[PDB]
Amino acid sequence: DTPAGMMMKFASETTKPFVDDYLLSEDVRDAVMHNYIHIHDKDYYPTKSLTCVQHPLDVILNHGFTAGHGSSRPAKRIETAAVLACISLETCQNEMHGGQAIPAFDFYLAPYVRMSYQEEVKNLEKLTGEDLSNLYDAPIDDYIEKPLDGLQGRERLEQHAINKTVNRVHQAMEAFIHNMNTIHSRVVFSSINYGTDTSAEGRCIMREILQSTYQGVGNGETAIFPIQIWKKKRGVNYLPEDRNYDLYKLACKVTARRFFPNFLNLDATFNQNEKWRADDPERYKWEIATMGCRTRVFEDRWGEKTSIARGNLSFSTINIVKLAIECMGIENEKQRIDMFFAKLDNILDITAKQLDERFQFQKTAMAKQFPLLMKYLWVGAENLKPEETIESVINHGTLGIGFIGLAECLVALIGKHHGESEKAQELGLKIITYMRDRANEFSEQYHHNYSILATPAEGLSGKFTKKDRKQFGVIPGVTDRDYYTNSNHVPVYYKCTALKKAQIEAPYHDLTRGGHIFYVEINPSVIESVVDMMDKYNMGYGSVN
Amino acid sequence: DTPAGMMMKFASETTKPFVDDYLLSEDVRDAVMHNYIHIHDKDYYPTKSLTCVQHPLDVILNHGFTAGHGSSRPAKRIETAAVLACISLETCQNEMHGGQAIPAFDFYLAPYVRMSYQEEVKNLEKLTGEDLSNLYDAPIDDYIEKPLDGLQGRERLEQHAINKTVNRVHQAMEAFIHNMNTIVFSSINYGTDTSAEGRCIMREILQSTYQGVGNGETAIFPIQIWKKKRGVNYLPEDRNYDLYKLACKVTARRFFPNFLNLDATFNQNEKWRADDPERYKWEIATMGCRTRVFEDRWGEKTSIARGNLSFSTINIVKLAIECMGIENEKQRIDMFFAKLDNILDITAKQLDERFQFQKTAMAKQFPLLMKYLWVGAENLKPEETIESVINHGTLGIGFIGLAECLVALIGKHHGESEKAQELGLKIITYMRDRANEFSEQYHHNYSILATPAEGLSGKFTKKDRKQFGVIPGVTDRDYYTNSNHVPVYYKCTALKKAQIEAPYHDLTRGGHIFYVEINPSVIESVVDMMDKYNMGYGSVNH
Ligand SMILES: Nc1ncnc2c1ncn2[C@H]1C[C@H](O)[C@@H](COP(=O)(O)OP(=O)(O)OP(=O)(O)O)O1
Ligand SMILES: Nc1ncnc2c1ncn2[C@H]1C[C@H](O)[C@@H](COP(=O)(O)OP(=O)(O)OP(=O)(O)O)O1
Ligand SMILES: [Mg+2]
Ligand SMILES: [Mg+2]
C-alpha cells in the first residue's frame, strides 16, 4: 500500500472517465464499453505520449540529453554508459505509457566496452611504465575470464586488463538487472533484445547478463525484470557451426530454471530486408526487434524498413469471443460462419478509425512536452523547433488492432476447438487472413500504418470472460473454465502434447504483424525441442516455462 | 507538459479537495482557507506518509532491503553504497511527501570508502604477488591526490592503491550529484568527521559542485550544508578549517553550500565527545527546508532515526492587520498576543488530529520506512498497528511575515526602529512557551518553525492585498519578506542585519535561516557574523 501507488490509482481513476467522455469518438467509445474493443493504456490519452519506442542510444551517448536543468555530457566508459541507458529508460518511461525497449543491446553498448578497455589499458603502466600504445586497435575474439595463476610476462597483465574489464561489465550488468528490478515507484517494463552482434564487446555483454539472471536477486530469488529476448538468426547462432551457438545453449539452460530469456526468430520469411550483410557497420537497422508486450515495428510504407527510432502510437484489443457467441442460434454452419465475418469487418474499421483519431490528437504536439522523447529518439526529431507543431515526425508510426480468445470462438458454431478437430483448424486460419487484408485496406485508406496483434492479455485476463455473462451464461465449454484462453492458443483444459500444439498454433504468426507468442507449460533439452518446433513451423516468438 | 507532471498534477487536484472536505477536522479546516494557516503537503494526507526523515544508512547497508520483490544483498564498495543511498532516498521519496536528508553524510559512507580502498588493495597484488595483509589497518591522514611522477619500492602498489581510490570515490559523488539533479529534494550535511575516510567524502563533493553540471552550468541539487563546530572546523587551528574555506570559495560563485552552526546554546548535548563512534547521534542535522528534530520529551536526545510528521504555517500579518484601527499601542499589542494563542492551540490540535490518522497504520503501507528506517522498528509485524513508534515524531507550527507585522501598530520595521526589535523579540518567545505547554497537554512534541517560503511566497500576499485594500509598506510591495528578516527594500549593511536577525534563532526550535545578497572574504565575514551571535543556520547567495 505504498503512497505512490495510491497517487497513481487516483490519477488513473480521475483520468479514465475524462478520456472516455472528452477525448474519444462516440462510435469507438460505444464499443470500448460493450466488450467488443478494449483501448490499452487509456489513462494516458490526454498526455500526447506514445506507447513504445526503440531508443537510439548513439545520439544520447555521443551527444548529451537535456531535460529542464538536467544538462548532461557525453558518456565516457561502461559504468557511465550502462547507467545512462538506465537513466534514459527511466526518464522516457516518465514521458510514455508503455514499455521501453533496447534493440540490439549488444550493438548499442559495444563501443563503450572498448572505450573502457582503452581506459584500463592506459592505467596498468602506472605501476611500471611501458610503451604499450598498440592496444587501442588490437583485435580480440572475446572477453573471457580465467584464473591468473601461471604466467611469466605481460600476458599475465595483458589479459588482466580484460579480467577487470569483464568484472566491471559484469557488475554493471548486475546493477542493470537490479536497477530494473528494484520497483519502488507507484514500475518500469524495460525489455532488451540481443543475439546478433558478432564482436567481442557484444558477446561479453550477452554472456555477463545471461549468467546474472541465472544467479538471481537476493539470496537466490528469481528476478522479474528486465524481460530478455534472444534473437535467433540462421548463419549466426542457430546451427551448431554458427558463431553464437554457445550463447543459445546458455539461454536454453537459463530458461530451464528461471523461465527467461524468451526466443525470437529472424528466420521467418516476414522478418527479412534487402540490406543485411555480415559486414555492415549498422546492419542492426534492418532487423525486427520485439519487447515483453509482443510489439513489432518493422516495415514502413513511406519510410525505410527499420525498427530503430520508430514505435507504436496506440493499440486496442478485439474480443472475437463475443462475436462467436452471438453467432450461435442458427442451425446451418455456413450461414453462421458467413455472419461471423460480417461482425469482424465493421469492428476492424472502428479500430482503424480510433487509431487514426488518436493520431489526429497526438499531432499538433510540442517537442518540449516530452523532453528527450521528441528531441533525440524519434525519427523526425532534430528538424523542428521546440514548439513548432511537430507534424513531419509522426508519419513514421504504426498502429495495432489486437485480438484474443480463439478457442472459445472455435467452439461456437462447430462445437470442437482446434485440438480435437481438423475442420476447426481450417476455420481458424480464415479469421486472421481476413483481418490482415482489411488492415492493409484501411492502411491504404487512412494513409497510415496498421497491423494485427495478439495481445499478451496481461491487463485483459478476465475482464471480458467475466463481463460476457450479461445476455447469456453457463455455456458448457466456454463460460465454465474461468479465464479465456490466449489469442490463438490450444486450451489449457485440453490435454495435448507439444508437437500437436506447435503444429496447430504455428500458421497464425505470419498473419499477425503486430505480435504473437507460442506458450508451453512444463535440462535444456525441453527448451531445445520447443525452439526446434518454433523454427520448423515458421513461428517467430516463443516462450516456455 | 510532461505526462509524469500531468499525472502528479491530476493526483494533487483530485486529492486536495478530498482532504479538505473529508479527512481533516472542521476546526482546523476553517483556518486553512481563511489565510491564517497553510498546511504543507496537503495532498499526501490520505496516504499514511510522514513528512521527512533522516536515513540511518547503517541498517540498510549492513543488511539489505526487501521492499517488494527487490531483495538486495548488503553493499560492498563505494559505488554500490552510494547507489544504494540514492536508491534509498528515491524509494523513501515515494513513501514520504517531504525531503530526504542524510544525517552526517560523511559519517555514513566512510566505512564503504575504506572497504572500496580495500577493493583495490588486493586487486593490485594480482600482477605482483605479495603478502600485503596490513593495509586494511594502516592509518592515513587524508586521501590525497598528486601527479604520479617518481616513486620506487613497496609504494607503487601499497601507496598508488591508496592514491588510485581518489578517482573511484570521486565521480561517485558526481553520479550522486547528477542523479539528484536529473528529473528529489535531497539534502546532505557534513563537516564533523575527522577521519580521512570522511574528509574524502567532503572534499570531492565541494569540488564537484563548483565545476557544475553540463558545460559549466550551475547545478541545482543536491542541497549541501556545512556543520561548523568549535573544536572541529571553525578556528584556523581546527582540523577542517581548509574545507570550510573551500566551501566559502565555492559559495562565492555557485551559491552553495549553506552553513550550519553547532556552536549554539540550543544545539548541545551531554553525551557528545570526540572519540565516540556514534557521537553523530547527538549532533544536530538539518535539511534545505529548515527542519530541526533534536528534542524528545519521552526519548533520548537524537536526530538519526526520526523526523517531522507534519507542520503548518501561520500568517502573523493577518493578525497584525486585523489589530490595526485602534489608536493606542499597548491595547493593540495585547490584542495581537490574544489572537496568537488561539491559533497556536488550533495548530497543536491539527498536529494531533493528523497524528490520529497517521496512528493505527500498517508497516506494509511503506516498506523500508517502518521496517528499517525509524525508531522502534524490528519489533512490529507487517500489519499489527505500529503505534509505539510514531510517538517519537515532531510537530511544527510555522510563521512568516515579520516585517508587515512590525509595521501595523508601530509603523517602522526592526531595520529602521529600535522599539520594533523589542516588540520583535516578544511574539516568538510566547509561541515557544505555548508550544511547550501544548506539548505537555496533547502529549506530543511541538516546535516553532520559520518556513522557507518555497511554496508559500505569494499565496498570502495576494489575498492580503485583495482582502482589505492597498496599504503602504504592507500589501503594496509585491512579495512578503521572509519569516523574520530585514525587508529587501532597505539599504542595510551586514552587521546591522545580523544584529537584528540574530536573537530569533534561539526562539525558533524548528527552523531558521539568515539570508545575505551580494573572493570568499564576503562569505567568511558572513560566517563570522553568524558565529558572533546565536544564529544556527545561515547562507549568503545572490
Ligand atoms: N547517476 C547518474 N544519473 C544521471 N546522469 C548521470 C549519472 N552518472 C552520470 N551521469 C551523466 C550526467 C553528467 O553530465 C555526465 C558526465 O559524463 P560521464 O559519462 O560521467 O563522463 P565525462 O565525459 O564527464 O568524464 P570525466 O568526468 O571522467 O571527465 O554523466
Ligand atoms: N544500480 C542499482 N540499483 C539498485 N540496486 C542496486 C544497484 N546496484 C546494486 N544494487 C543492489 C542490489 C544487489 O542485490 C546489491 C548487491 O550489491 P553489491 O555490494 O555490489 O553486491 P554483492 O554484495 O553481491 O557483491 P559482489 O557482487 O561483488 O560479490 O546491490
Ligand atoms: Mg553480485
Ligand atoms: Mg566528470
Domains belonging to chain A, first-starting first, are 22-54+307-545 (3.20.70.20)
User: Do the Cβ atoms of A71 and B213 come within 8 Å?
Assistant: yes
The DSSP-derived string for B174-215 is: HHHHHHHH----EEEEE----SHHHHHHHHHHHHHHHH-BTT
Grid cell in block for residue B211: 565545476
Across the beta sheet with B394-400, the strand order is B37-39, B308-315, B394-400, B446-450
From A323, A478, A464, select the one nearest A415 (Cα to Cα).
Answer: A478
Q: Cell match 586488463: residue?
A: A161
The DSSP-derived string for A224-235 is: --SEEEEEE-TT
Grid cell in block for residue A464: 471480458
Please name the method used to determine this structure: cryo-EM
Q: Whose CA is nearest to atom 25 of ligand 2?
A: B76
* Backbone Cα Rg of chain B: 25
User: Do the Cβ atoms of A91 and B183 come within 8 Å?
Assistant: yes
Residues counted in chain A: 545
Residues of B in contact with A87 (CB under 8 A): 179, 182
Sequence-ordered list of residues with C-beta below 8 angstroms from that of A149, at least 6 positions apart, any chain: none
What are the residues facing B446 on neighbouring strands? B395
The DSSP-derived string for A448-501 is: S-EEEEE---SS-SSHHHHHTTTS----TTTTTSSS---SS---TTS---HHHH
Report how far residue A112's alpha carbon sits from residue A381's, in angstroms, rounded to the nearest whole number.
25
- Distance (Å) from the C-alpha of residue A186 to the closest C-alpha of chain B? 7
* Cis amide linkage into residue B222, ω under 30° from 0: yes
Q: Are B534 and B505 in contact (CB under 8 A)?
A: yes
What are the residues facing A450 on neighbouring strands? A399
- Distance (Å) from the C-alpha of residue B312 to the closest C-alpha of chain A? 21
Residues counted in chain B: 542
Q: Are A127 and B156 in contact (CB under 8 A)?
A: yes
* Neighbour tally for A239: CB within 10 Å: 11
> What angle in degrees, to the nearest 10, is found between the helix axes of B521-532 and B241-254?
120
| Substitution target from B69, B95, B164, B220 for chain A, most A beta carbons within 10 A | B69
Half-sphere exposure of B274 (CA within 13 A, CB side): 6
Sequence-ordered list of residues with C-beta below 8 angstroms from that of A82, at least 6 positions apart, any chain: A109, A112, A172, A173, A175, A176
Phi and psi torsions of B494, nearest 5°: -90, -35
- From B166, B176, B178, mutation site for ligand 1 pocket: most ligand atoms within 8 A of C-beta: B178
Handedness of CA B332, B337, B342, B348 (dihedral sign): positive
Kind plus residue range of the DSSP H or E element containing A274:
none
Report how far residue B87's alpha carbon sits from residue A353's, in angstroms, rounded to the nearest whole number.
44
Closest atom of ligand 1 relative to the A81 alpha carbon: 19
- Distance (Å) from the C-alpha of residue B365 to the closest C-alpha of chain A? 4
Report how far residue A535's alpha carbon sits from residue A545's, in angstroms, rounded to the nearest whole number.
18
Q: Cell match 594480482: residue?
A: B126
Name the pairing type of β-strands A311-319 and A398-404. parallel
Q: How far apart are the first and last CA of chain B?
A: 30
Report how far residue A269's alpha carbon sits from residue A461's, in angstroms, rounded to the nearest whole number.
31
Q: Are A439 and A511 in contact (CB under 8 A)?
A: no
Report how far residue B148's alpha carbon sits from residue B155's, in angstroms, rounded to the nearest whole number.
11
* Neighbour tally for B301: CB within 10 Å: 15
- Distance (Å) from the C-alpha of residue B130 to the closest C-alpha of chain A? 14
Sequence-ordered list of residues with C-beta below 8 angstroms from that of A335, at least 6 positions apart, any chain: none
Report the SS3 class of residue B285. Answer: coil
- Distance (angstroms) between ligand 4 centre and the Cα of B175 equals 9
**B495-501, Cβ contacts within 8 angstroms, sequence gap of 24 or more:** B495/B529, B496/B415, B497/B415, B498/B529, B498/B530, B498/B532, B498/B533, B498/B535, B499/B533, B500/B414, B500/B415, B500/B421
Residues of B in contact with A167 (CB under 8 A): none
The DSSP-derived string for A34-96 is: TTSEEETTGGGTTTT--SEEB--HHHHHHS---STT-------SHHHHHHHHHHHHHHHHTT-
Determine if residue B227 is left, alpha or beta; phi over 0 gives left, psi from -120 to 50 gives alpha, anything else beta.
Answer: beta
Grid cell in block for residue B38: 497553510
- Distance (angstroms) between ligand 3 centre and the Cα of A76 equals 23
- Distance (angstroms) between ligand 2 centre and the Cα of A67 equals 28
Report how far residue B9's alpha carbon sits from residue B3's, in angstroms, rounded to the nearest whole number.
10
Handedness of CA B486, B488, B490, B493 (dihedral sign): positive
- From A84, A174, A224, mutation site for ligand 2 pocket: most ligand atoms within 8 A of C-beta: A174
Q: How far apart are the first and last CA of chain A?
A: 30
Q: Whose CA is nearest to atom 13 of ligand 2?
A: B72
> What angle in degrees, to the nearest 10, is found between the helix axes of A78-93 and A160-181?
20
* Cis amide linkage into residue A226, ω under 30° from 0: yes
Half-sphere exposure of A239 (CA within 13 A, CB side): 6
- From A179, A185, A208, A213, mutation site for ligand 2 pocket: most ligand atoms within 8 A of C-beta: A179
The DSSP-derived string for A171-200 is: HHHHHHHHHHH---------EEEES---SH
* Measured CA angle at B399 (ends B436, B263), to 5 deg: 65
Report how far residue B481's alpha carbon sits from residue B281's, in angstroms, rounded to the nearest whole number.
35
Which numbered ligand comes closest to the C-alpha of A62? 1
* Neighbour tally for B378: CB within 10 Å: 8
Report how far residue B490's alpha carbon sits from residue B499's, in angstroms, rounded to the nearest whole number.
15
Report how far residue A506's alpha carbon sits from residue A499's, in angstroms, rounded to the nearest whole number.
11
From B434, B459, B455, select the one nearest B446 (Cα to Cα).
Answer: B434
Secondary structure tally for chain B: helices H, strands E: 19, 11
Rounded-to-5 percentages of helix, strand, coil across chain A: 40, 10, 50
- The answer to whether the CB of A87 is under 6 A from ligand 1 is yes
* Neighbour tally for A459: CB within 10 Å: 11
Grid cell in block for residue A276: 543485411
Name the pairing type of β-strands A450-454 and A519-520. unpaired
- Distance (angstroms) between ligand 4 centre and the Cα of B73 equals 29
CB-nearest partner of A181 from B14, B70, B124: B70
* Measured CA angle at B179 (ends B206, B304), to 5 deg: 70
Half-sphere exposure of A528 (CA within 13 A, CB side): 13
Phi and psi torsions of B306, nearest 5°: -145, -175
Q: Are A418 and A428 in contact (CB under 8 A)?
A: yes
> What angle in degrees, to the nearest 10, is found between the helix axes of B110-123 and B196-211?
100
